Design a protein around this ligand. Sequence first.
Ligand code: 5FL
Ligand code: 5FL
Ligand code: CL
Lengths: 242, 242
Amino acid sequence: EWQENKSWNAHFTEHKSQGVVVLWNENKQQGFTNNLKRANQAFLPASTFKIPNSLIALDLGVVKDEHQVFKWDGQTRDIATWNRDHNLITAMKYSVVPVYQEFARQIGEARMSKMLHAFDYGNEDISGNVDSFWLDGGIRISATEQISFLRKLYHNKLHVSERSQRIVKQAMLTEANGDYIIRAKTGYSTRIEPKIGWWVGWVELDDNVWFFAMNMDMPTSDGLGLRQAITKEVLKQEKIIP
Amino acid sequence: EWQENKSWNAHFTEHKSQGVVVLWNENKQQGFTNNLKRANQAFLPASTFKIPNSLIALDLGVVKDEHQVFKWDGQTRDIATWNRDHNLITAMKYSVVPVYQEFARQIGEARMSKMLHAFDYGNEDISGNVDSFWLDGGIRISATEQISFLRKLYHNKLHVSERSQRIVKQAMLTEANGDYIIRAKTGYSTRIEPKIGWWVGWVELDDNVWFFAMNMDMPTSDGLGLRQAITKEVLKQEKIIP
Ligand SMILES: O=C(O)c1cccc(-c2ccncc2)c1
Ligand SMILES: O=C(O)c1cccc(-c2ccncc2)c1
Ligand SMILES: [Cl-]
């Protein structure tokens, strides 16, 4: 079941923003959120779509392994980190859109659609440009649906090879220490309203795993750092991390 | 290719200790150490042997995956974390000797011997008790030999399944942030003189990989923390980590 905790809103109001945090206790099979309605509100996935995109590219051979180099095309873009060669790890670390756009082109409209249906991903609607539908197309997904999708990935239950799912889980590595491990992916939807920021993944503990998925209104890029900051303060309140 | 940098000794002396640090730049294929002799002096692997031990156990089916639970045998031991159920992740995280002793028993002398030779691991001598040879048996490995093994693990070139190697590298995960990822294994040898502590692994960067292997005199358990502190103080000096 699910369960609402309005107290987390204090973290959002503390930063003069508003959004939703959704946690899932794998052991107890229980979910927690500050806003059950927005937890089920479907938004554009934006760069969080790089998870299923990576899975499909790997399983089809578009990506050989996490070391394959995808050379810069030479176009100077507003994000400096995008103007250099990348591999799967760095491409996901820096949310390099142009690399995954090339993945989607080679994947193809048809194969992308078939796989997202097998993943049961959001509304499964890729309408728009094959190389930007997750940014300005018709695909939509809610926070609870992210967790459902993420859970399949953790258990290697998605309909792709185990290898592909392990590699993507490796590429999602964000932070790790003696207390926890975080495998997650950021997102920043700016092309179509509402402008929001994503952060979806999970926290690995010794004896349990806490899946999470959060989105928040992001009218300007200054507040991107709040995606992780607000998430972590909820984790510290729930005593999941020191 | 190899170069000696006696300046690093300052990090050992300010802590009233002695030891060796060995670095290998994968891109440039160059190695650096503070003591060429000790870098090639072979010691007992101790708990660093849990890398090859895990690889063999996985490849033979002794360990099904990183989720298989290994039940505490109900015998109280002086290490609190050992009086607990474990999987490969927590077992390696907490150096749970009893769990790996059962691995070796199930693996068997013959298969254990055969595999270590394929790995070209240390002196490849499993002489002693199958359930403790890496602690008070005849097997020996030097810091430089550890790196040659670690490098084969990183490139999946060892004579075991790719999956087995990916799993162990996941279990080796120790620390991660926006600047680097560390996958390593600690060691603490006390049954045969000299008493030492190990730390072998590597640092993953965006554009390079730094392999490392260090051991230091450990007369008492009070200085175990210096294994990581000293190693990191060298990494900062070589500007491998901020
Ligand atoms: O957080 C993300 O996922 C993401 C993706 C693409 C671009 C940017 C971005 C845009 C402007 N200034 C800073 C960062 C962020
Ligand atoms: O650091 C390790 O890898 C390790 C492995 C096994 C045991 C111990 C140990 C033994 C006594 N007191 C404290 C710790 C340490
Ligand atoms: Cl990993």
